[PDB]
Amino acid sequence: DFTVASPAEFVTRFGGDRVIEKVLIANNGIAAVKCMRSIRRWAYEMFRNERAIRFVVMVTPEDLKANAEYIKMADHYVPVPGGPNNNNYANVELIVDIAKRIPVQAVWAGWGHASENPKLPELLCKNGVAFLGPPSEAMWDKIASTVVAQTLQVPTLPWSGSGLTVEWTEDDLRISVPEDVYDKGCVKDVDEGLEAAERIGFPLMIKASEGGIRKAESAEDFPILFRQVQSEIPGSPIFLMKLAQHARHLEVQILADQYGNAVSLFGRDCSIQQKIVEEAPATIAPLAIFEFMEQCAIRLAKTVGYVSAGTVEYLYSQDGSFHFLELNPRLQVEHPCTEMIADVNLPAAQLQIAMGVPLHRLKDIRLLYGESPWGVTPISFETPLARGHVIAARITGTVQELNFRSSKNVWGYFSVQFGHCFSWGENREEAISNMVVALKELSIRTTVEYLINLLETESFQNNDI
């Protein structure tokens, strides 16, 4: 019930600093379709015009030949070289050239391809183009980020850099890891390798940071395996990190604006492991523990100057301990789980953030926090209940939506085959049951029998680790 005439009017009235009305999508397949469907839906709601934000897509010969849906869906497309993605979707220089020549005001890369390449936002920024994602400085490996996490009192697994911290009360006058602290997290010799490994305990991983990884069971296996890592990527820093036991992958979803505000959007639990089944919210962890995880995730995001959507990945074990793995600096294909339980349109939030709109002016965010939809006053994101429950199951640039007649709260896609079904319920029990009902409709096979067995076992229904 608050609408405006155009993107320029929107940016002004909602406190932004940059008009974005045409976006280049450097991706194909489901990413491109979902980006467009989500932002057009928001565009319809904000401007009463579904095409107020225009989309240009990049298209390979392969995608054209298959007549991929996202091609005709877009308002414009640009043919690009085929072959492996270094020729097309992951080619930063090409993405940037296309973006300047059209011109568009922003690029969305979604997941895969160049989405994790710092050089993309950097070159886009150099050239006056926005990125729907974190800035290059934010996005600027496992050794440094783990040191940054420890500096901010986020728990990490025992590793060759355990206990390292950096100078930080430098305040919101971006953190940085000194070359000299970085090295103490590295093992140079088999000899100092073995010493570090005796502090850490076995089993542990030996990892080339420029990856080149071996699992080591003992001090006797260690030297052979360490030499193998060095042979596989010569010159790389090597670090050691302890394996985790009786553990589960969980994530906190984060959304940050360009003003140092960041909020969590609950998170996700991979309850069957690649991920076969993913769930939102992560009910495996007691709420008090998960909110502490959220607060750690948020502090990390603010300190590195994160912008846009991102995931903080954790391991969680039966004994309640959790450990930071990494901040995955992009939207993920499983994001509809989060959108559903939080009622947040994530690609549209990414767009609004790229136009300079603050978090507290994002309507979905205000409503999530029980505030007026169109108020202007800041919100304490430190001082919401999940909307039901979602199970996402992996089933196994053309995109076919999945067709449910008898099953109700279920949707999905597959593409060329792999896809997901997503099932919502008022609680976990109903979400699981709706999923099983949908898979049975799907079965009129192999993937469905595999999943249905999974979902029907007591261990899963109880959510054991």
Side-chain angles (χ1 to χ4, degrees), residues 91-113:
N91 190 320
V92 170
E93 304 68 28
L94 169 66
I95 292 163
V96 176
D97 283 339
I98 294 168
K100 302 157 54 171
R101 86 151 115 103
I102 299 278
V104 305
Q105 293 86 46
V107 174
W108 182 96
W111 49 97
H113 306 311

PDB file of all heavy atoms in Angstrom, residues 91-113:
ATOM      1  N   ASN A  91      33.885 -15.446 -16.724  1.00  0.00           N
ATOM      2  CA  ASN A  91      34.861 -14.542 -17.312  1.00  0.00           C
ATOM      3  C   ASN A  91      34.606 -13.101 -16.914  1.00  0.00           C
ATOM      4  O   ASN A  91      33.766 -12.425 -17.505  1.00  0.00           O
ATOM      5  CB  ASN A  91      34.830 -14.631 -18.831  1.00  0.00           C
ATOM      6  CG  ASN A  91      35.988 -13.885 -19.481  1.00  0.00           C
ATOM      7  OD1 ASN A  91      36.370 -12.801 -19.054  1.00  0.00           O
ATOM      8  ND2 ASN A  91      36.553 -14.479 -20.522  1.00  0.00           N
ATOM      9  N   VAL A  92      35.347 -12.629 -15.919  1.00  0.00           N
ATOM     10  CA  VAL A  92      35.081 -11.322 -15.346  1.00  0.00           C
ATOM     11  C   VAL A  92      35.219 -10.202 -16.359  1.00  0.00           C
ATOM     12  O   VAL A  92      34.417  -9.272 -16.402  1.00  0.00           O
ATOM     13  CB  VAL A  92      36.023 -11.059 -14.146  1.00  0.00           C
ATOM     14  CG1 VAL A  92      35.926  -9.619 -13.712  1.00  0.00           C
ATOM     15  CG2 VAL A  92      35.646 -12.006 -12.991  1.00  0.00           C
ATOM     16  N   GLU A  93      36.239 -10.284 -17.191  1.00  0.00           N
ATOM     17  CA  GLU A  93      36.474  -9.193 -18.119  1.00  0.00           C
ATOM     18  C   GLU A  93      35.311  -9.069 -19.122  1.00  0.00           C
ATOM     19  O   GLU A  93      34.868  -7.962 -19.460  1.00  0.00           O
ATOM     20  CB  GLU A  93      37.806  -9.436 -18.838  1.00  0.00           C
ATOM     21  CG  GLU A  93      39.000  -9.609 -17.886  1.00  0.00           C
ATOM     22  CD  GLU A  93      38.960 -10.905 -17.028  1.00  0.00           C
ATOM     23  OE1 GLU A  93      38.376 -11.950 -17.429  1.00  0.00           O
ATOM     24  OE2 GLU A  93      39.539 -10.860 -15.921  1.00  0.00           O
ATOM     25  N   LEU A  94      34.810 -10.208 -19.588  1.00  0.00           N
ATOM     26  CA  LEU A  94      33.660 -10.207 -20.481  1.00  0.00           C
ATOM     27  C   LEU A  94      32.389  -9.665 -19.804  1.00  0.00           C
ATOM     28  O   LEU A  94      31.642  -8.876 -20.387  1.00  0.00           O
ATOM     29  CB  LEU A  94      33.419 -11.622 -20.978  1.00  0.00           C
ATOM     30  CG  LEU A  94      32.109 -11.899 -21.724  1.00  0.00           C
ATOM     31  CD1 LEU A  94      32.062 -11.124 -23.069  1.00  0.00           C
ATOM     32  CD2 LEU A  94      32.002 -13.411 -21.955  1.00  0.00           C
ATOM     33  N   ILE A  95      32.149 -10.080 -18.564  1.00  0.00           N
ATOM     34  CA  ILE A  95      30.957  -9.645 -17.853  1.00  0.00           C
ATOM     35  C   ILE A  95      31.018  -8.123 -17.773  1.00  0.00           C
ATOM     36  O   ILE A  95      30.049  -7.415 -18.091  1.00  0.00           O
ATOM     37  CB  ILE A  95      30.899 -10.259 -16.410  1.00  0.00           C
ATOM     38  CG1 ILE A  95      30.673 -11.771 -16.493  1.00  0.00           C
ATOM     39  CG2 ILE A  95      29.800  -9.563 -15.605  1.00  0.00           C
ATOM     40  CD1 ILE A  95      31.007 -12.555 -15.198  1.00  0.00           C
ATOM     41  N   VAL A  96      32.171  -7.620 -17.349  1.00  0.00           N
ATOM     42  CA  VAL A  96      32.348  -6.187 -17.184  1.00  0.00           C
ATOM     43  C   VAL A  96      32.190  -5.420 -18.519  1.00  0.00           C
ATOM     44  O   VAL A  96      31.543  -4.364 -18.574  1.00  0.00           O
ATOM     45  CB  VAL A  96      33.746  -5.888 -16.585  1.00  0.00           C
ATOM     46  CG1 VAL A  96      33.954  -4.397 -16.503  1.00  0.00           C
ATOM     47  CG2 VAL A  96      33.853  -6.512 -15.200  1.00  0.00           C
ATOM     48  N   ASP A  97      32.778  -5.951 -19.589  1.00  0.00           N
ATOM     49  CA  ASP A  97      32.654  -5.308 -20.908  1.00  0.00           C
ATOM     50  C   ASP A  97      31.207  -5.225 -21.321  1.00  0.00           C
ATOM     51  O   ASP A  97      30.743  -4.169 -21.714  1.00  0.00           O
ATOM     52  CB  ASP A  97      33.416  -6.083 -21.985  1.00  0.00           C
ATOM     53  CG  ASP A  97      34.909  -5.846 -21.929  1.00  0.00           C
ATOM     54  OD1 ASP A  97      35.341  -4.808 -21.352  1.00  0.00           O
ATOM     55  OD2 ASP A  97      35.654  -6.710 -22.466  1.00  0.00           O
ATOM     56  N   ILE A  98      30.490  -6.338 -21.226  1.00  0.00           N
ATOM     57  CA  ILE A  98      29.072  -6.332 -21.565  1.00  0.00           C
ATOM     58  C   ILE A  98      28.372  -5.301 -20.713  1.00  0.00           C
ATOM     59  O   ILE A  98      27.580  -4.509 -21.214  1.00  0.00           O
ATOM     60  CB  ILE A  98      28.416  -7.724 -21.329  1.00  0.00           C
ATOM     61  CG1 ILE A  98      29.002  -8.751 -22.317  1.00  0.00           C
ATOM     62  CG2 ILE A  98      26.898  -7.629 -21.510  1.00  0.00           C
ATOM     63  CD1 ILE A  98      28.637 -10.196 -21.992  1.00  0.00           C
ATOM     64  N   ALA A  99      28.685  -5.272 -19.421  1.00  0.00           N
ATOM     65  CA  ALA A  99      27.963  -4.370 -18.534  1.00  0.00           C
ATOM     66  C   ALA A  99      28.174  -2.894 -18.877  1.00  0.00           C
ATOM     67  O   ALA A  99      27.260  -2.105 -18.759  1.00  0.00           O
ATOM     68  CB  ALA A  99      28.362  -4.621 -17.072  1.00  0.00           C
ATOM     69  N   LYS A 100      29.383  -2.520 -19.282  1.00  0.00           N
ATOM     70  CA  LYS A 100      29.665  -1.124 -19.652  1.00  0.00           C
ATOM     71  C   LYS A 100      29.066  -0.767 -20.998  1.00  0.00           C
ATOM     72  O   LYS A 100      28.636   0.357 -21.204  1.00  0.00           O
ATOM     73  CB  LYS A 100      31.160  -0.854 -19.757  1.00  0.00           C
ATOM     74  CG  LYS A 100      31.941  -1.134 -18.523  1.00  0.00           C
ATOM     75  CD  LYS A 100      33.385  -1.385 -18.928  1.00  0.00           C
ATOM     76  CE  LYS A 100      33.902  -0.239 -19.760  1.00  0.00           C
ATOM     77  NZ  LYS A 100      35.370  -0.383 -19.956  1.00  0.00           N
ATOM     78  N   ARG A 101      29.041  -1.719 -21.917  1.00  0.00           N
ATOM     79  CA  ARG A 101      28.595  -1.408 -23.263  1.00  0.00           C
ATOM     80  C   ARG A 101      27.088  -1.298 -23.422  1.00  0.00           C
ATOM     81  O   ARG A 101      26.612  -0.535 -24.265  1.00  0.00           O
ATOM     82  CB  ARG A 101      29.136  -2.444 -24.247  1.00  0.00           C
ATOM     83  CG  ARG A 101      28.265  -3.690 -24.394  1.00  0.00           C
ATOM     84  CD  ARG A 101      28.437  -4.261 -25.791  1.00  0.00           C
ATOM     85  NE  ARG A 101      29.056  -5.584 -25.766  1.00  0.00           N
ATOM     86  CZ  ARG A 101      28.374  -6.715 -25.939  1.00  0.00           C
ATOM     87  NH1 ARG A 101      27.052  -6.667 -26.156  1.00  0.00           N
ATOM     88  NH2 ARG A 101      29.006  -7.893 -25.909  1.00  0.00           N
ATOM     89  N   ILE A 102      26.318  -2.045 -22.633  1.00  0.00           N
ATOM     90  CA  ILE A 102      24.868  -1.996 -22.812  1.00  0.00           C
ATOM     91  C   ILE A 102      24.298  -0.579 -22.676  1.00  0.00           C
ATOM     92  O   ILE A 102      23.646  -0.089 -23.578  1.00  0.00           O
ATOM     93  CB  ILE A 102      24.093  -2.950 -21.837  1.00  0.00           C
ATOM     94  CG1 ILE A 102      24.503  -4.415 -22.070  1.00  0.00           C
ATOM     95  CG2 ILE A 102      22.586  -2.827 -22.090  1.00  0.00           C
ATOM     96  CD1 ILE A 102      23.804  -5.073 -23.217  1.00  0.00           C
ATOM     97  N   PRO A 103      24.513   0.100 -21.544  1.00  0.00           N
ATOM     98  CA  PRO A 103      25.104  -0.224 -20.244  1.00  0.00           C
ATOM     99  C   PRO A 103      24.000  -0.695 -19.262  1.00  0.00           C
ATOM    100  O   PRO A 103      22.825  -0.434 -19.479  1.00  0.00           O
ATOM    101  CB  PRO A 103      25.717   1.107 -19.820  1.00  0.00           C
ATOM    102  CG  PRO A 103      24.665   2.153 -20.328  1.00  0.00           C
ATOM    103  CD  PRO A 103      23.990   1.485 -21.563  1.00  0.00           C
ATOM    104  N   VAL A 104      24.383  -1.401 -18.203  1.00  0.00           N
ATOM    105  CA  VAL A 104      23.451  -1.737 -17.130  1.00  0.00           C
ATOM    106  C   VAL A 104      23.986  -1.050 -15.879  1.00  0.00           C
ATOM    107  O   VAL A 104      25.136  -0.604 -15.865  1.00  0.00           O
ATOM    108  CB  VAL A 104      23.400  -3.256 -16.890  1.00  0.00           C
ATOM    109  CG1 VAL A 104      23.047  -3.995 -18.218  1.00  0.00           C
ATOM    110  CG2 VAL A 104      24.751  -3.732 -16.341  1.00  0.00           C
ATOM    111  N   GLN A 105      23.173  -0.955 -14.838  1.00  0.00           N
ATOM    112  CA  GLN A 105      23.639  -0.299 -13.618  1.00  0.00           C
ATOM    113  C   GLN A 105      24.170  -1.287 -12.587  1.00  0.00           C
ATOM    114  O   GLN A 105      24.771  -0.881 -11.582  1.00  0.00           O
ATOM    115  CB  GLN A 105      22.527   0.563 -13.010  1.00  0.00           C
ATOM    116  CG  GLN A 105      22.161   1.767 -13.870  1.00  0.00           C
ATOM    117  CD  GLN A 105      21.134   1.439 -14.923  1.00  0.00           C
ATOM    118  OE1 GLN A 105      20.130   0.793 -14.639  1.00  0.00           O
ATOM    119  NE2 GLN A 105      21.384   1.876 -16.164  1.00  0.00           N
ATOM    120  N   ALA A 106      23.969  -2.580 -12.840  1.00  0.00           N
ATOM    121  CA  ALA A 106      24.343  -3.590 -11.868  1.00  0.00           C
ATOM    122  C   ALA A 106      24.362  -4.995 -12.489  1.00  0.00           C
ATOM    123  O   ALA A 106      23.683  -5.267 -13.493  1.00  0.00           O
ATOM    124  CB  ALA A 106      23.381  -3.544 -10.682  1.00  0.00           C
ATOM    125  N   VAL A 107      25.166  -5.863 -11.877  1.00  0.00           N
ATOM    126  CA  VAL A 107      25.290  -7.263 -12.269  1.00  0.00           C
ATOM    127  C   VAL A 107      24.882  -8.115 -11.073  1.00  0.00           C
ATOM    128  O   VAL A 107      25.211  -7.785  -9.926  1.00  0.00           O
ATOM    129  CB  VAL A 107      26.777  -7.633 -12.646  1.00  0.00           C
ATOM    130  CG1 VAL A 107      26.892  -9.114 -12.892  1.00  0.00           C
ATOM    131  CG2 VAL A 107      27.220  -6.857 -13.894  1.00  0.00           C
ATOM    132  N   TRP A 108      24.160  -9.198 -11.347  1.00  0.00           N
ATOM    133  CA  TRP A 108      23.883 -10.248 -10.360  1.00  0.00           C
ATOM    134  C   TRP A 108      24.506 -11.531 -10.914  1.00  0.00           C
ATOM    135  O   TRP A 108      24.316 -11.869 -12.088  1.00  0.00           O
ATOM    136  CB  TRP A 108      22.364 -10.424 -10.216  1.00  0.00           C
ATOM    137  CG  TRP A 108      21.891 -11.438  -9.184  1.00  0.00           C
ATOM    138  CD1 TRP A 108      21.512 -11.171  -7.891  1.00  0.00           C
ATOM    139  CD2 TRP A 108      21.585 -12.830  -9.408  1.00  0.00           C
ATOM    140  NE1 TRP A 108      20.987 -12.302  -7.305  1.00  0.00           N
ATOM    141  CE2 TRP A 108      21.014 -13.332  -8.215  1.00  0.00           C
ATOM    142  CE3 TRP A 108      21.723 -13.690 -10.502  1.00  0.00           C
ATOM    143  CZ2 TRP A 108      20.576 -14.661  -8.087  1.00  0.00           C
ATOM    144  CZ3 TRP A 108      21.290 -15.008 -10.379  1.00  0.00           C
ATOM    145  CH2 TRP A 108      20.721 -15.481  -9.178  1.00  0.00           C
ATOM    146  N   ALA A 109      25.248 -12.243 -10.071  1.00  0.00           N
ATOM    147  CA  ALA A 109      25.941 -13.445 -10.483  1.00  0.00           C
ATOM    148  C   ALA A 109      25.344 -14.660  -9.805  1.00  0.00           C
ATOM    149  O   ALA A 109      25.615 -15.784 -10.196  1.00  0.00           O
ATOM    150  CB  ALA A 109      27.401 -13.321 -10.144  1.00  0.00           C
ATOM    151  N   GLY A 110      24.528 -14.444  -8.779  1.00  0.00           N
ATOM    152  CA  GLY A 110      23.917 -15.576  -8.094  1.00  0.00           C
ATOM    153  C   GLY A 110      24.959 -16.524  -7.535  1.00  0.00           C
ATOM    154  O   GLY A 110      25.863 -16.089  -6.840  1.00  0.00           O
ATOM    155  N   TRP A 111      24.856 -17.815  -7.838  1.00  0.00           N
ATOM    156  CA  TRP A 111      25.835 -18.795  -7.325  1.00  0.00           C
ATOM    157  C   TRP A 111      26.637 -19.460  -8.464  1.00  0.00           C
ATOM    158  O   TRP A 111      26.229 -19.409  -9.614  1.00  0.00           O
ATOM    159  CB  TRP A 111      25.120 -19.855  -6.496  1.00  0.00           C
ATOM    160  CG  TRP A 111      23.899 -20.440  -7.186  1.00  0.00           C
ATOM    161  CD1 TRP A 111      23.827 -21.626  -7.915  1.00  0.00           C
ATOM    162  CD2 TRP A 111      22.566 -19.917  -7.148  1.00  0.00           C
ATOM    163  NE1 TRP A 111      22.531 -21.850  -8.308  1.00  0.00           N
ATOM    164  CE2 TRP A 111      21.739 -20.823  -7.860  1.00  0.00           C
ATOM    165  CE3 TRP A 111      21.983 -18.772  -6.576  1.00  0.00           C
ATOM    166  CZ2 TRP A 111      20.356 -20.617  -8.021  1.00  0.00           C
ATOM    167  CZ3 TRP A 111      20.622 -18.568  -6.732  1.00  0.00           C
ATOM    168  CH2 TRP A 111      19.824 -19.487  -7.450  1.00  0.00           C
ATOM    169  N   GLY A 112      27.791 -20.046  -8.142  1.00  0.00           N
ATOM    170  CA  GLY A 112      28.645 -20.651  -9.146  1.00  0.00           C
ATOM    171  C   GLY A 112      29.383 -19.584  -9.940  1.00  0.00           C
ATOM    172  O   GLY A 112      29.366 -18.398  -9.601  1.00  0.00           O
ATOM    173  N   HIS A 113      30.032 -20.017 -11.019  1.00  0.00           N
ATOM    174  CA  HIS A 113      30.752 -19.133 -11.943  1.00  0.00           C
ATOM    175  C   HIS A 113      31.546 -18.083 -11.169  1.00  0.00           C
ATOM    176  O   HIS A 113      32.226 -18.423 -10.215  1.00  0.00           O
ATOM    177  CB  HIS A 113      29.784 -18.459 -12.892  1.00  0.00           C
ATOM    178  CG  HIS A 113      28.919 -19.483 -13.614  1.00  0.00           C
ATOM    179  ND1 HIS A 113      29.461 -20.589 -14.235  1.00  0.00           N
ATOM    180  CD2 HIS A 113      27.580 -19.571 -13.783  1.00  0.00           C
ATOM    181  CE1 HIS A 113      28.488 -21.323 -14.745  1.00  0.00           C
ATOM    182  NE2 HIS A 113      27.338 -20.728 -14.483  1.00  0.00           N
TER     183      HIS A 113
END
